[PDB]
Design a protein around this ligand. Structure first.
Ligand code: BTN
Ligand code: BTN
Ligand code: BTN
Ligand code: BTN
Ligand code: NAG
Ligand code: NAG
Ligand code: NAG
Ligand code: NAG
Lengths: 121, 121, 121, 121
C-alpha cells in the first residue's frame, strides 16, 4: 500500500514530514521548502491535509494545505500515492500557490500552478 | 475584516459551511456540491482548510481540502477573502481536482483545474 | 454556430479581434489587454491561434497564443465557443501566462493560471 | 542560443517537429503524441506556435497550439527554451487540455492541466 506517513523529499529539494493519518484519513506534518517566490526568509511551516479512503485504496488520492509562516500566501497540493514500476513509492503532486493581493482587481494574477514529485527521504 | 466562518454558495451552485477558524488558522466545514465529474450520487463531504495569519490580515489568504465521500477523488481550493467594493465579502478561489488513476502511467490526465466565486449564502 | 470571427471583450476589460478562420481552422487577430503583470507599458500585441474542426462542431474547441510585444512573456488560452442559454455567444477560456526566468532553477514559479469569459464586443 | 527548430521528444514519450521560426517569431510543426485521453486512434497533428522576441533573448519564451486530428480537443503549450547546465537545450512547458462539452453547464470539467519536459530527439 502506498503510505503518506514518513519523511519525503522533492525534485526542488524541499522536505516534508507527514505523520500517522487517522481513521478519518486526516494527517498533519511540517514542510521545509527549499525555494520561495518571496525573497523573505524561509521558515518551516505547518501542513494539515487529508487522504481519500472510500474504497480503502492502495494508492490513495490526497490533498494538503501549507500555511506559510514566512509569507502571507497559501499553497495547496493534490496528488496520489503511487508504487512506481521499480517497486518504490512516489507522490505525484500538482500545486496552486496563491499570493495575497490588495485590491480585488489584482486577483487575476495571484495564482501560480506547478508540479512536484516527492520521494521517500 | 473578511471572515470565512459562515454559510457560502458558489457559481456552480454548491453550498459550503465553515465554522470557527481557530487561533492556529484552522477550520473544518462541510461541502455540498451541486455538480460532479463522476456519475456517482453526490454526498455532503468534509472540509479541512487553513487561513494564513501572517500580518493579521483583514483580507486573508486560505486553502482547504475537500474529501469526497462519493468518489475516490480529492479537491483542493486556494483563494482569498475579499471585501467587494459594494460592501460584501466575496471568496475568489481556484481549485485542483485529483482523480485516482489505476496505473502511474495514466497520472498525466488525473488533474483538472478551475475557478469558483463564493458568496455569503 | 458559434464563431470566433469578430470583436470580443472580456471580464477584465481586454478586447480582442479575431479574423476569418480559414479551412485549416486557423486564424489571427490582435489583443489589447487592459491589465498586465508587468508594470511595463501595454501595447496591442498579435494573436495567432487555431480551432478544432474534426466533426465540424457548432461550438468548437480552440486555442491561441499571444506574443507579448511589451514584455518577454507569452500567454496561451484554450476554451470553447458556446451559445449560452440566453441565446448569445460566450467564450469560456482558461489561460496559462508564462514569464521569462533567467536560470532554469527559477522555472518553478514562471507560470500563472487563470480564467476569462469573452463576450461579443 | 536556445533554438526551437528541430525534432523533440518528451517524458510521456511524444515526439514533435518544429521548423523554421520566421522573423515574426512564428513556426509550424507536427505533434505525434504517445498518449491520449480519448480511446480514439492517435494521429499526428498540426502545431502553430510563436516565440516571444522582445530583447532578442537567448533563452526565449514560447507558446503553441496543437490541433488534434483524432479528437474534438485542443491543447495549448507554454514554456521556455533553457540551456541546461550540462550544456543541452531543454524545453520546460505546462499545457492546458480543452475537451468539448455538449452543454455550457459542463464547462467546469473540460480543462486539464500538466507539465512536459522536452529534449532534442
Ligand atoms: O514564496 C512563498 O510565498 C511561499 C513559498 C513557496 C514555496 C513553493 S509551494 C510550491 C513549490 N514547491 C515547493 O517545494 N516549494 C514551492
Ligand atoms: O466528481 C468527483 O469526483 C467529485 C466532484 C467534485 C466537484 C468539483 S470540485 C471543483 C468544482 N467546483 C464545484 O463546486 N464542484 C466541482
Ligand atoms: O504582463 C505581461 O507580461 C503580459 C500581459 C499579461 C496579460 C494577461 S494574459 C491573461 C490575463 N487576461 C487578460 O485579458 N490579460 C491578462
Ligand atoms: O485525448 C485527446 O483528446 C488528445 C490527446 C492529447 C494528449 C495530451 S495533450 C498534453 C499531454 N502531453 C502529451 O504529450 N500528451 C498529452
Ligand atoms: C532536508 O533534506 C536533508 C536531509 O533530510 C537536509 O540536509 C536539508 O537541509 C533539508 N532541506 C531543507 C530545505 O530543509
Ligand atoms: C444549498 O443552498 C440552498 C440553501 O442551503 C439550498 O436551498 C440548495 O438546495 C442547496 N444547493 C445545493 C446544490 O445543494
Ligand atoms: C476596447 O473596448 C472599448 C471599445 O471596443 C475601448 O473603448 C477600450 O479602450 C478598449 N480597451 C482596451 C484595453 O484597449
Ligand atoms: C518517436 O520517437 C522516435 C524517433 O522519432 C520513434 O522511434 C518513436 O517510435 C516515436 N514515438 C512515438 C510515441 O511516436
Amino acid at each position: 500500500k502506498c503510505s503518506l506517513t514518513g519523511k519525503w523529499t522533492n525534485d526542488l529539494g524541499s522536505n516534508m514530514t507527514i505523520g500517522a493519518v487517522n481513521s478519518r484519513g486526516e494527517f498533519t506534518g511540517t514542510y521545509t521548502t527549499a525555494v520561495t517566490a518571496t525573497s523573505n526568509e524561509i521558515k518551516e511551516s505547518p501542513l494539515h491535509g487529508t487522504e481519500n479512503t472510500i474504497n480503502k485504496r492502495t494508492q490513495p488520492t490526497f490533498g494538503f494545505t501549507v500555511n506559510w509562516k514566512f509569507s502571507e500566501s497559501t499553497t495547496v497540493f493534490t496528488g496520489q500515492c503511487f508504487i512506481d514500476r521499480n517497486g518504490k513509492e512516489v507522490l505525484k503532486t500538482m500545486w496552486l500557490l496563491r499570493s495575497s493581493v490588495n485590491d480585488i482587481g489584482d486577483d487575476w494574477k495571484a495564482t501560480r500552478v506547478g508540479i512536484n514529485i516527492f520521494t521517500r527521504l
